[PDB]
C-alpha cells in the first residue's frame, strides 16, 4: 500500500553563485534524507539499498524540488536558502545553458500544467525508487515500489483531473528531461569539487 496522502505529507513536512548553489545543496541533502524516510516503505528497504537509491537520485530529487518552488519566480530559481539564481549568475557559474533548460524544460512546464504537490511528491518518489541504481541487493523490489507509486499517482490524476486524460503520461514524460538535466548539473558539481570551489568537509562532498 502506497497512499498518495502520505507522499503529500512527506512533501509538506519538509518544504558567489557556486557557493550559493553548493551551500543550498548541502542544506537540502539533509532535508532529502528526512523526506525519503517519510515515503512509505523506503525505510523498510535494506540500509545499503537506501544508500544506493539516494546516491543515485539526490541530484534529480533536488532539481525537481527547486524547479517546482520556482514556478512563480520571474526568470530564475529560488534556492532553499532564500537566495535566487538568475541568468547572469548562472553564466558566472558557467551553467547558463543548463539553467535555461531548467526554466524551459521543468519550471515553465510545471507552471503551464499547474503540477500540484501530490504530483511532484509522486514524481520524486518514482525517481527515488530507481531500480536501475547500481549494486542494489534486489532491483526488482525497488521496481515493485516504483510501480505502486505510479499506480497511486495515476488514480489520483484520474480522480482529481478526469478532464485531462493525458495528464499522468504528461507528468511521467518530464522525467527524461529531469534525468539529462540532473546529469549535466552533476558534471558541473564534480568540476566545482575538482577545482576546489566547493565547501570542504560537507555532506555534499561525500555525495560527490
Amino acid at each position: 500500500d502506497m497512499p498518495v496522502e502520505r507522499i503529500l505529507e512527506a512533501e509538506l513536512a519538509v518544504e558567489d553563485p557556486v557557493t550559493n548553489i553548493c551551500q543550498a545543496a548541502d542544506k537540502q541533502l539533509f532535508t532529502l534524507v528526512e523526506w525519503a524516510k517519510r515515503i512509505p516503505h523506503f525505510s523498510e528497504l535494506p540500509l545499503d539499498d537506501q544508500v544506493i537509491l539516494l546516491r543515485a537520485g539526490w541530484n534529480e530529487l533536488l532539481i525537481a524540488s527547486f524547479s517546482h518552488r520556482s514556478i512563480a519566480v520571474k526568470d530564475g530559481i529560488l534556492l532553499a536558502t532564500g537566495l535566487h539564481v538568475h541568468r547572469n549568475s548562472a553564466h558566472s557559474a558557467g551553467v547558463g545553458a543548463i539553467f535555461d533548460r531548467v526554466l524551459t524544460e521543468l519550471v515553465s512546464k510545471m507552471r503551464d500544467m499547474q503540477m500540484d504537490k501530490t504530483e511532484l511528491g509522486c514524481l520524486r518518489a518514482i525517481v527515488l525508487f530507481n531500480p536501475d541504481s547500481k549494486g542494489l541487493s534486489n532491483p526488482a523490489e525497488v521496481e515493485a515500489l516504483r510501480e505502486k507509486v505510479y499506480a497511486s499517482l495515476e488514480a489520483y490524476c484520474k480522480h482529481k483531473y478526469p478532464e485531462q486524460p493525458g495528464r499522468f503520461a504528461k507528468l511521467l514524460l518530464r522525467l527524461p528531461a529531469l534525468r539529462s538535466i540532473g546529469l549535466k548539473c552533476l558534471e558541473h558539481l564534480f568540476f566545482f569539487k575538482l577545482i576546489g570551489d566547493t565547501p570542504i568537509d560537507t555532506f555534499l562532498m561525500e555525495m560527490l
Binding site: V33, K37, L47, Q50, V51, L54, R55, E206, M207
Partner: peptide
C-alpha cells in the same frame, strides 16, 4: 558514505 548511512538510521 558514512554520513548518509548514519542519517538514515
Amino acid at each position: 558514505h558514512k554520513i548518509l548511512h548514519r542519517l538514515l538510521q
